[PDB]
Design a protein. Sequence first.
Lengths: 50, 266, 223
Amino acid sequence: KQLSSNFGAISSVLNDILSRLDPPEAEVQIDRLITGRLQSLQTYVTQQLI
Amino acid sequence: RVQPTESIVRFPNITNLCPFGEVFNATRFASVYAWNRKRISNCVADYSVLYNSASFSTFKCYGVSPTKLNDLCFTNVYADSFVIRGDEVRQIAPGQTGKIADYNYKLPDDFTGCVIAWNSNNLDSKNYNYLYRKPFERDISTPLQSYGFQPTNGVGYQPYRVVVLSFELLHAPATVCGPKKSTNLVKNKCVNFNFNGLTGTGVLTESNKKFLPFQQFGRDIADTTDAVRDPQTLEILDITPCSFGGVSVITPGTNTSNEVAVLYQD
Amino acid sequence: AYTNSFTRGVYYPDKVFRSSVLHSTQDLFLPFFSNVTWFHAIHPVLPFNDGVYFASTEKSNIIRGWIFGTTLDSKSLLIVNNATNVVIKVCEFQFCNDPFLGVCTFEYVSFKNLREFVFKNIDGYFKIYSKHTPINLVRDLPQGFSALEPLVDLPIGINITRFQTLLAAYYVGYLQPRTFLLKYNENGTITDAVDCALDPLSETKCTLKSFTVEKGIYQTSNF
């Protein structure tokens, strides 16, 4: 379900951002998505180890 | 990862050239308080004609890119046609306020579209026909101040014709497509499919899913497209992802041999 | 008079297929068991507010359409279902004081029956959800659930605060921005719904994301 979170992006779909935007803005939106999914994954891995 | 064997560009069987000649070469434009909204539907719309035209004073796409405009198919396209003062060009943007921005024409913050404007000093100025004072509020109740457009005035006082190309995003069967050549639909292969901008990679199989007729594409728990409907053949096709697994090299050590065995994962 | 709205007023929030998933969504919905107003036409201009639930148990389809808008007379939407064609115009038609049927930016040309409609406008886009089902009841709205589906969306750009139903009783409700947990079946149709702010049982059901809540104490919201 945390895949579906936008984290401030225009969509949670990566391909929509890649197909809609030029890379000077699409890299920023993708950067927000990597930040959100990486934080969610690190939280998950922390729960996994505990 | 199983690599994609081919690619599929799929667009519906529409061949209609899209009427931008009545929009951008119009003999009359609306006022900013009584702005002309024209619905655009069911056409092959080439926006690179508008993007490569050097007669336009500005070109500001926000939600998409003008290079990607022909790559996407839109559901509903509306051209907000109004004649405004060139000093209020910068008011046509999300999250602003002004005489035209907060009274005459309010534009939404989450706006997905492009705004095109150009000078009309040699067309509209001679004139006081164009007047001024929630998103898209066309209040025409009369309290209304007119524009003093003359051709001998300054650049900030020249009349400028502004077209706001708003695009409704794809949550539905779309109708306003770009100039994309449709391809043949290969089944049971990892393909780089494209259903009106719904790009992706997977195995296209036949499905027994029963869509509602107002629905373009299904979705999954992970907000991913589980199924699509082909826009040229009314059938429901699942998208199974390409078969993927990790690579695990069994080695007895380089102290014994260099012969390895490759275990693929699941 | 008044009738019980029961479980009705739930439509499809989007044009996206889902199946076998308990999807929770938020949109303008008619709340569960709300106090909808009974109108009868044997032996009226009503407000619009924010979204209108409609329902009409028609024995012979006397009710054929509605007039929407703010002033509703030559200054407005209009649906006319004459013979077997639903003729719709958005013209500023000269309507009557009590507009009735005998025995221009848009133009469209196409108790035993329950015809339910949901009328709302989102930034001028007049989204209409509709569903017709056969019934056998002469008294009121029957206790049952059936989803409504979007068929007509019109970017009218028209402010609407009043509406009037023209003609087989009818019932008028109002949509509210309430969170709704919907249950899609194996076939992808809405079969069951939960309002997330009706009562603390349904608040517990919305919190746990399940239509079955077992024994225990469950923190739901903040008083």
